[PDB]
Amino acid sequence: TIALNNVVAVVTGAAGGIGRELVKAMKAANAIVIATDMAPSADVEGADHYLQHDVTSEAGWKAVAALAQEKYGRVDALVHNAGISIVTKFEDTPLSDFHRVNTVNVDSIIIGTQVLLPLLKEGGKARAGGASVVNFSSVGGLRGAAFLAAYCTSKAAVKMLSKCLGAEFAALGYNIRVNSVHPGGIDTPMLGSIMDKAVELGAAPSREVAQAAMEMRHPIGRMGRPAEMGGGVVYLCSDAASFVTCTEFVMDGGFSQV
Amino acid sequence: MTIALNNVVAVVTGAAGGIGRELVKAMKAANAIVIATDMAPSADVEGADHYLQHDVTSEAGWKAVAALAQEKYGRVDALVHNAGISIVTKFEDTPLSDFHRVNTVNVDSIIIGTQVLLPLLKEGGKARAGGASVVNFSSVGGLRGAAFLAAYCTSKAAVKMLSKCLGAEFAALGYNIRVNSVHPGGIDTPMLGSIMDKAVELGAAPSREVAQAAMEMRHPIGRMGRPAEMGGGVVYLCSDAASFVTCTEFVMDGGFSQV
Amino acid sequence: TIALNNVVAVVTGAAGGIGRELVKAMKAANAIVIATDMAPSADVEGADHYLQHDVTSEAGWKAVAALAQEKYGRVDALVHNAGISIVTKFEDTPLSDFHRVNTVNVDSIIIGTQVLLPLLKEGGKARAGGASVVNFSSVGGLRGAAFLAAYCTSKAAVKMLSKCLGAEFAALGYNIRVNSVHPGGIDTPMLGSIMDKAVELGAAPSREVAQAAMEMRHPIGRMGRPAEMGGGVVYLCSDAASFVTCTEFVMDGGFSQV
Amino acid sequence: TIALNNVVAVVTGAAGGIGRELVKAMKAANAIVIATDMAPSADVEGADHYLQHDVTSEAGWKAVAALAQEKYGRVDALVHNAGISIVTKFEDTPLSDFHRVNTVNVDSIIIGTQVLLPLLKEGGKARAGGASVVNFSSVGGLRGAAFLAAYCTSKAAVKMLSKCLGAEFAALGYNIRVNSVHPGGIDTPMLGSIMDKAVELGAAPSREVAQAAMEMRHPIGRMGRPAEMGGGVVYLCSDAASFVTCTEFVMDGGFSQV
Ligand SMILES: NC(=O)c1ccc[n+]([C@@H]2O[C@H](COP(=O)([O-])OP(=O)(O)OC[C@H]3O[C@@H](n4cnc5c(N)ncnc54)[C@H](O)[C@@H]3O)[C@@H](O)[C@H]2O)c1
Numbered sequence A, C, D: 001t002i003a004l005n006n007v008v009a010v011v012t013g014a015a016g017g018i019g020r021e022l023v024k025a026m027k028a029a030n031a032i033v034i035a036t037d038m039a040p041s042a043d044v045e046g047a048d049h050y051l052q053h054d055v056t057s058e059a060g061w062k063a064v065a066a067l068a069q070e071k072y073g074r075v076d077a078l079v080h081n082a083g084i085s086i087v088t089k090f091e092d093t094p095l096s097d098f099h100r101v102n103t104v105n106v107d108s109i110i111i112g113t114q115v116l117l118p119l120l121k122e123g124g125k126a127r128a129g130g131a132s133v134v135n136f137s138s139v140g141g142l143r144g145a146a147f148l149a150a151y152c153t154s155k156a157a158v159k160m161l162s163k164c165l166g167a168e169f170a171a172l173g174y175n176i177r178v179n180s181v182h183p184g185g186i187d188t189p190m191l192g193s194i195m196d197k198a199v200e201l202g203a204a205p206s207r208e209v210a211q212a213a214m215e216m217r218h219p220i221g222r223m224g225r226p227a228e229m230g231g232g233v234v235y236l237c238s239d240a241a242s243f244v245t246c247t248e249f250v251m252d253g254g255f256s257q258v
Numbered sequence B: 001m002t003i004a005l006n007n008v009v010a011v012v013t014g015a016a017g018g019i020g021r022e023l024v025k026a027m028k029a030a031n032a033i034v035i036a037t038d039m040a041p042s043a044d045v046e047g048a049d050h051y052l053q054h055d056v057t058s059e060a061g062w063k064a065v066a067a068l069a070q071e072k073y074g075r076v077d078a079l080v081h082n083a084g085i086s087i088v089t090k091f092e093d094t095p096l097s098d099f100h101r102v103n104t105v106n107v108d109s110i111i112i113g114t115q116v117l118l119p120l121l122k123e124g125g126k127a128r129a130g131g132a133s134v135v136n137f138s139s140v141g142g143l144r145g146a147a148f149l150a151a152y153c154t155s156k157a158a159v160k161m162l163s164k165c166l167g168a169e170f171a172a173l174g175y176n177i178r179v180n181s182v183h184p185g186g187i188d189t190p191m192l193g194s195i196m197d198k199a200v201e202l203g204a205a206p207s208r209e210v211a212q213a214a215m216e217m218r219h220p221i222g223r224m225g226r227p228a229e230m231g232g233g234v235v236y237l238c239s240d241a242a243s244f245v246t247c248t249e250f251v252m253d254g255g256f257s258q259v
């Protein structure tokens, strides 16, 4: 079947809405999971290890590399799930707000992948299918939206970085697959904040009209649940996805395709 | 839970072909009940619970598939439209009837088959919260054009767009049927073999080795796919794990379309 | 800058909403225009010739080729603008309805381009920039929609045929550019009928709710006017577009990109 | 007709290969052109004004706004053409190289558009078709490539920022169109440097094999000339493009579509 036997997996933002479900799903497929987030401690069901980890910190990433190096000697799967959103009027958004979003959503992938690259190369030797790097983009990386300039721009950067790394790692013979994941509206605190800030900005009349409008834009007719992200990430991390690199893996209830 | 097809009644067309045989094996391995169909009057398809002779261009052929599924199971949970053909031709020497022949196998198959199995797919939609799953075999050729592949590419773009429309329509009508398109890159099957040889005979390529190396180098991963590398993706789309996936382009192309 | 001096242009569906504006725009850029449509006669402003022409008829296309051959000896620009739409429930749509839409929207381009290919090759020798074939696809060729299965499928076929012919004509050295045009909601009888059938199908509560919904899906916030298609087609037909082939040329008020 | 009569246009990187052709083409369509680049002085054919302008400098942009405000009272067209490229091995690329490319290619558009927004709103009142913002992305913003991680990521950011601003400015009623332009391989010093650095990196055996490979990846079979970018930018800046916003305008010889 589709499984993660003998897969050492790093999952960032692992205490968040999607992150907790990714850890559960990956443990259920038999992965060894190093879960990381900003809290000094967390109870992440399915994590074999929890590390305090700011994805903007090279030192934080070196601590992840040290634990993986010491305990396992490789990383087979790297899930860059940590990210933030802001909802703002472009003309009232200082350059520093774009930079803050870029640092969390994009620099995290650049720093993390550079620091774990020796360990990912070892995973490329451990499985014929390759090591697997899974970057959380968004439907916002595919389709623009009013008031989401900073967020959408960062998620398009994540998408394109995924294509470039997939092509480069294959050309250099590292046997490391890199793919971008594009969730639609998923029922988490992040989507909650975006909807509330849309109301305060006066993009939506009320939080109920906003919710109904966003749900109706999805052909499937509802928000996604965080658990509905799990199987896709397990697939991309598995040897079943050995021919999948540089790809836009969409889990959006049809949002981007209508 | 995990990614599995427990109590999934699956119809797979072109099931005796290079990819089709691996789809049946993969889906059986995930515990699906598989009705395999192809043009031969009989075939030994590893993992098939039933084999039916089935021309996907024939409404009567599809009604025989519906009758067996109706009688034995009362539903269809997964429908994999994998039957397809390719031609390689000079546009100016391609009669309208060659476009129509490719359209009939690659597109009309999905229209006729989905219409005939729709009552059974609606029952699939009631049997699983995630929905019935219709998986349409498009191509990277449905995403990116190519010289001398006008008839094939046009049909595979039609398959892709039909998938989006049916996903949106079945959701709007409340049927709980997911529809997605699959886009393989160059997969090592008799079909890829014939396309390369016919490219040589047409005088597109010097030799079969230069053709193969050129096609391999277009894939960032640096090689053609193996048929077995299609199996997991189709199992995922057919499973409840893909409950939030409809209208989607599911690409298995070694990076071909993205550089 | 952007002109069609010494350009012999064939425009199909030339009596329709967009077609009439294409002929006006192309005449205004100094093209010689052969206008064609289903009516036995028409007064098409800017046309140097009108021909009765069923785009599904090889004999109809041969009559267009004969007039162009006899009077000018070439075709520099071929605009495949003829098309139909239907709005239907998939499960109630006979295969013959898909085939009827395919015959007008796709077979027209196959038959017409094959019949005019000798004349387009002469266009290819007359201008460094090349002969130009402009195929009318749709945003419906880029994004799906409930109840538009037959229409959307045909317009995606038009889009992909455009890419294949652009690549093939370049590989064979014919100097013929081929591009697809993707209009959004344009205010013509065709959009009117689609909206009116959407109501009778019970897809929309009223035509006013349908119209407002469709207008709001366009970021620009309104339907296009037929005249807003003219400049884009003039550009693609001109030497200014000498580096444009196989391209999706979108005129959709941002519809496809959100 | 496609013209820029009474259009006040700002063009950045105006002394470059493409920039000089954009200024010539826009003057030929009767635009008033404020040309800007890094040099303290330059002889830019077709420019009514030249300003020294670092597109990373808020103060530099305020000087452009002051001249336009004083002399014309509006900006009708803003062409963000300034940009840089690097070719690097991801694992040897410091975070500061990504940031440098982002600052020139993306922050330029954020700072410039914020500073000129009052003047663009006046452009929006001067023409029913709207003010026009044209952002130079790349085929690199659509398709990834090995060794172009920093460049491709920045050009995908430019593409998505274009979609977001098009949607946002329309939602706020400012009547400002925003589009991204995606050139293929254009014969300029920038393409020259990329090809040479590809050889030094050992991505290509020789500069002749690199050149032939890049030319053959374009269906049209050659590099573009800078002049082949001019018509497209004139079209997007004109009232002929009144229904074009949020759009990917591709001038790539078919590169992205095969
Ligand atoms: N929920 C949606 O609708 C949606 C849609 C598109 C994509 N996404 C993406 O999915 C991913 C998961 O989002 P979510 O919905 O679970 O949101 P969430 O906010 O619940 O989870 C994000 C997690 O990232 C962590 N994080 C933030 N900054 C960090 C930093 N500097 N260092 C370390 N950890 C940091 C947060 O602590 C949080 O636990 C994100 O990449 C998000 O952008 C979400």
Ligand SMILES: NC(=O)c1ccc[n+]([C@@H]2O[C@H](COP(=O)([O-])OP(=O)(O)OC[C@H]3O[C@@H](n4cnc5c(N)ncnc54)[C@H](O)[C@@H]3O)[C@@H](O)[C@H]2O)c1
Pocket: B013, B014, B015, B016, B017, B018, B019, B020, B037, B038, B039, B054, B055, B056, B057, B081, B082, B083, B084, B085, B086, B105, B137, B138, B139, B140, B183, B184, B185, B186, B187, B188, B189, B190, B191, B192
């Ligand atoms: N191999 C590749 O490189 C490649 C690339 C992209 C897409 N695909 C698609 O994958 C699918 C499977 O292809 P494959 O490579 O295994 O090809 P294949 O030729 O090995 O198998 C296709 C099967 O369809 C059957 N078939 C043909 N016409 C039929 C009809 N009228 N009724 C019933 N069955 C019919 C054939 O007999 C065959 O068993 C096709 O849709 C193909 O277009 C393959």
Ligand SMILES: NC(=O)c1ccc[n+]([C@@H]2O[C@H](COP(=O)([O-])OP(=O)(O)OC[C@H]3O[C@@H](n4cnc5c(N)ncnc54)[C@H](O)[C@@H]3O)[C@@H](O)[C@H]2O)c1
Pocket: C012, C013, C014, C015, C016, C017, C018, C019, C036, C037, C038, C039, C053, C054, C055, C056, C080, C081, C082, C083, C084, C085, C104, C136, C137, C138, C139, C140, C182, C183, C184, C185, C186, C187, C188, C189, C190, C191
């Ligand atoms: N209006 C829109 O919203 C919209 C949307 C996207 C695409 N388009 C496309 O733009 C093009 C122009 O359409 P329009 O909106 O002006 O519609 P229209 O119906 O006003 O014009 C289309 C013309 O095609 C002609 N035609 C139909 N069948 C023909 C045949 N067999 N032979 C010859 N001529 C035939 C009709 O006589 C008519 O004059 C079409 O291809 C259409 O699908 C329009």
Ligand SMILES: NC(=O)c1ccc[n+]([C@@H]2O[C@H](COP(=O)([O-])OP(=O)(O)OC[C@H]3O[C@@H](n4cnc5c(N)ncnc54)[C@H](O)[C@@H]3O)[C@@H](O)[C@H]2O)c1
Pocket: D012, D013, D014, D015, D016, D017, D018, D019, D036, D037, D038, D053, D054, D055, D056, D080, D081, D082, D083, D084, D104, D136, D137, D138, D139, D182, D183, D184, D185, D186, D187, D188, D189, D190, D191
């Ligand atoms: N030439 C190609 O093949 C190609 C490919 C795709 C995209 N592009 C894009 O086209 C645009 C123009 O490219 P080109 O080939 O003319 O490049 P070029 O190097 O010839 O011109 C770019 C100009 O930008 C200017 N510039 C650089 N940094 C600046 C700064 N901080 N402030 C102000 N001006 C600055 C340079 O001085 C130069 O004159 C760029 O945005 C480039 O990314 C070009």
